Amino acid sequence: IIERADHFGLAQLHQLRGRVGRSHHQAYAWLLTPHPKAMTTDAQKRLEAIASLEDLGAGFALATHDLEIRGAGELLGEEQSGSMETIGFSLYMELLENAVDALKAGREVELRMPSLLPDDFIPDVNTRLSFYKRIASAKTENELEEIKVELIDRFGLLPDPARTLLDIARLRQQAQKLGIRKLEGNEKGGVIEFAEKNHVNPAWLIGLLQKQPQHYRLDGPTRLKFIQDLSERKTRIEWVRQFMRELEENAI
Amino acid sequence: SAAVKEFFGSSQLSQFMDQNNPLSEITHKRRISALGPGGLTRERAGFEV
RNA sequence: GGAGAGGUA
DNA sequence: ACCGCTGCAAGGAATAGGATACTTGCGGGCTATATGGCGGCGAATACCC
DNA sequence: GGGTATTCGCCGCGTACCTCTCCTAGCCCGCAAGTATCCTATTCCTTGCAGCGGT
Numbered sequence: 225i226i227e228r229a230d231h232f233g234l235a236q237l238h239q240l241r242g243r244v245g246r247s248h249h250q251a252y253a254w255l256l257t258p259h260p261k262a263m264t265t266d267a268q269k270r271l272e273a274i275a276s277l278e279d280l281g282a283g284f285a286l287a288t289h290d291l292e293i294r295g296a297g298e299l300l301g302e303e304q305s306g307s308m309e310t311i312g313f314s315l316y317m318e319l320l321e322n323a324v325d326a327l328k329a330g331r332e333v334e335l336r337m338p339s340l341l342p343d344d345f346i347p348d349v350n351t352r353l354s355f356y357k358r359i360a361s362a363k364t365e366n367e368l369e370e371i372k373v374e375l376i377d378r379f380g381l382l383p384d385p386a387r388t389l390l391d392i393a394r395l396r397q398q399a400q401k402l403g404i405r406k407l408e409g410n411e412k413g414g415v416i417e418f419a420e421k422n423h424v425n426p427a428w429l430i431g432l433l434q435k436q437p438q439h440y441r442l443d444g445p446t447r448l449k450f451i452q453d454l455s456e457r458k459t460r461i462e463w464v465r466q467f468m469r470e471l472e473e474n475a476i
Numbered sequence: 477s478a479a480v481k482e483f484f485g486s487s488q489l490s491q492f493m494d495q496n497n498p499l500s501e502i503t504h505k506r507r508i509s510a511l512g513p514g515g516l517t518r519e520r521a522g523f524e525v
Numbered sequence: 526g527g528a529g530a531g532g533u534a
Numbered sequence: 535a536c537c538g539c540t541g542c543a544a545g546g547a548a549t550a551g552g553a554t555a556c557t558t559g560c561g562g563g564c565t566a567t568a569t570g571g572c573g574g575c576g577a578a579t580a581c582c583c
Numbered sequence: 584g585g586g587t588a589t590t591c592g593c594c595g596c597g598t599a600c601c602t603c604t605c606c607t608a609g610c611c612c613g614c615a616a617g618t619a620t621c622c623t624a625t626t627c628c629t630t631g632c633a634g635c636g637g638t
Contacts, residue, residue, distance in 0.1 A: 231554055491530055516570045
């Protein structure tokens with residue numbers, strides 16, 4: 225018994241109706257509705273369609289109606305239901321074959337900011353994935369610089385997501401050597417989660433704590449909370465850079 | 477918008493600029509007309525004016 | 526095509 | 535045989551993301567109130583006998 | 584009545600050529616494009632009262 229079935233998709237209504245029966249018994253399915261004039265037109269259409277089809281095996285005719293009433297969505301993207309002006313199947317198969325053939329002959333410091341290679345930067349996907357692998361697997365700032373020069377050579381200017389990705393790779397490279405396993409940051413501050421055996425000078429750490437108690441608070445064995453009004457992505461990047469630099473200068 | 481745009485873009489006083497001289501521009505800008513809205517008509521003026 | 530403005534003899 | 539401490543529960547907010555319907559922003563594509571010119575003339579009133 | 588005067592409204596005011604700008608307001612209706620509430624995952628912690636060692 226559906227108390228108010230006007231606001232339910234055809235798929236949902238059919239699924240709910242499919243919960244009754246399942247055995248030799250005769251099963252009913254009441255879809256209670258408000259006064260019909262108060263119902264929206266699409267609710268009337270869906271209710272008349274669902275009540276129009278009451279047969280065993282009708283789940284496929286209903287599916288093929290829900291498709292071509294809502295239409296199939298972007299074949300290559302999201303938005304599964306809807307017109308969406310999707311690309312044709314002939315184009316999709318051609319692009320898939322092209323990517324396949326091209327691929328055959330081939331083969332954390334998160335700061336709540338986009339750090340990626342945008343589509344307008346590198347159109348094709350395989351190059352993007354290859355550069356992701358190259359940046360994430362680069363173990364020296366020199367190789368990060370080489371990747372940066374290669375990017376500039378092959379595509380020109382580096383978008384802000386690309387530069388943020390590269391400097392995040394550099395920061396993670398520094399932190400891997402240092403001992404900070406997870407350096408976090410948001411608009412309001414961040415948390416430093418050190419390793420079991422970090423390389424932070426204890427006396428200098430206590431000096432930082434006692435000079436800025438408001439900006440350095442140990443909450444746990446390895447969790448250090450710092451509170452900073454990090455409104456800007458660039459300012460946060462440089463503040464983290466200098467924090468880690470002053471850390472490594474005192475590393476023991 | 478209509479009330480002001482219509483006047484500026486299309487009126488009997490907002491006229492093209494003769495520009496084939498510095499002198500042309502100057503003398504044109506200093507012009508003192510007697511026609512237009514609220515003014516007498518070119519083809520019904522006696523000698524006295 | 527028609528309006529309006531300016532200009533030459 | 536009293537007491538500060540630890541630990542086992544209690545108490546829930548904010549998002550992702552697939553739904554469902556509201557709310558509107560818009561653009562193309564429709565319908566629908568004067569006051570600087572005279573001169574001449576013929577016809578239409580006014581009138582005072 | 585009528586001869587006269589007075590008013591009122593209509594009709595009329597050069598040729599030829601060159602440059603330029605601009606030719607409805609507003610409504611409606613449908614497209615379509617951008618938003619408040621409902622379930623199953625997630626990261627975010629801050630209290631209340633009984634055990635409980637320990638002396």
